[PDB]
Amino acid sequence: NPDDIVVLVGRKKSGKSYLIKHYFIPVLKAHKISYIIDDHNLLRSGSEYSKFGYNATSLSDIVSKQYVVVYDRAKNDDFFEKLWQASKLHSKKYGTTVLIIDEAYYHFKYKQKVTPAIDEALHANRHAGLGLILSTQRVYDLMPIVYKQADLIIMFYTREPNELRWISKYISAEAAEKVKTLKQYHFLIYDVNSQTIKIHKPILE
Ligand SMILES: Nc1ncnc2c1ncn2[C@@H]1O[C@H](COP(=O)(O)OP(=O)(O)CP(=O)(O)O)[C@@H](O)[C@H]1O
Numbered sequence: 001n002p003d004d005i006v007v008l009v010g011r012k013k014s015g016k017s018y019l020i021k022h023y024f025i026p027v028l029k030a031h032k033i034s035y036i037i038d039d040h041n042l043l044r045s046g047s048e049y050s051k052f053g054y055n056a057t058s059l060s061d062i063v064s065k066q067y068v069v070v071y072d073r074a075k076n077d078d079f080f081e082k083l084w085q086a087s088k089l090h091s092k093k094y095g096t097t098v099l100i101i102d103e104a105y106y107h108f109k110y111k112q113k114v115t116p117a118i119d120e121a122l123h124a125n126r127h128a129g130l131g132l133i134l135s136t137q138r139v140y141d142l143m144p145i146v147y148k149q150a151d152l153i154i155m156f157y158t159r160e161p162n163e164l165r166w167i168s169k170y171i172s173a174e175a176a177e178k179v180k181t182l183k184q185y186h187f188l189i190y191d192v193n194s195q196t197i198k199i200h201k202p203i204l205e
C-alpha cells in the first residue's frame with residue numbers, strides 16, 4: 001500500500017537507507033508512484049539522495065516535480081510544517097505520494113512537540129493522500145506514537161536493553177526476541193495491523 005506508514009529502524013550501516021534506495025524507491029517508481037524525499041545528509045557534492053529525483057530549491061518545485069528531493073538545512077518544526085502542506089498539494093496533482101524522511105528524529109523526536117503537521121501525518125495521512133517512510137537509528141529516538149500509528153515496522157539487529165524494552169512495549173514482545181539474532185543486512189518486518197512477523201533475507205540490489 002502506497003499510503004502505508006512504514007518505519008525503518010537500524011543502527012548506522014545496518015542497511016536501512018540501502019533498503020530505501022534499492023527496494024522501496026524502485027518499487028514505487030515501478031508502480032508509477034511519486035515520492036518526496038526530506039534529506040538531512042550533505043555529501044561532498046549534493047545530498048545523500050540527490051541522484052533520486054529533482055533537487056528542489058523552492059516550495060513550487062516540491063509541488064510540481066514528480067520525483068523530488070528536498071535538502072533540509074533548518075531541520076526544525078517550521079520546516080516540516082511547510083513541507084507537509086507542500087506535500088499535500090503535490091499529492092493533489094500526482095495522486096497518492098510517499099513522503100520519505102531519512103533521519104526522521106529531526107521531526108518526530110521522542111519528547112518533542114506534536115505540531116498540527118505531525119498529528120496529521122500520523123493520523124490522517126490516507127485522507128491527505130500521503131504515505132510515509134520514516135527512518136531512524138535507535139527505536140527510542142522517536143515518539144512512541146509513531147510505532148502505534150505505523151502499518152509496517154522494519155527492524156535490523158539489536159540487543160541494546162533499552163531498545164528491546166521499547167520494542168516489547170510499543171511494537172511487539174515477539175519482535176523484541178527475534179531482533180536479537182538477525183544477521184548482517186537481515187531484517188524483521190512487523191505488520192502492525194495483523195500483528196504478524198516475517199524475517200527477511202538481505203535484499204539483492
Ligand atoms: N542488502 C545488502 N546487501 C549488500 N550490502 C548492503 C546491503 N544493505 C546495506 N549494504 C551495505 O551497507 C552500507 C551501509 O548501508 P546504509 O547506508 O543503508 O545504512 P545506514 O542508512 O544506516 C548508514 P547512515 O547512518 O550513514 O545513513 C552500504 O554502503 C551498503 O554497501
Ligand SMILES: [Mg+2]
Pocket residue numbers: 016017018102
Ligand atoms: Mg542512512
Ligand SMILES: [Mg+2]
Pocket residue numbers: none
Ligand atoms: Mg554485553
Ligand SMILES: [Zn+2]
Pocket residue numbers: 038039040072075076079080106107
Ligand atoms: Zn527534514
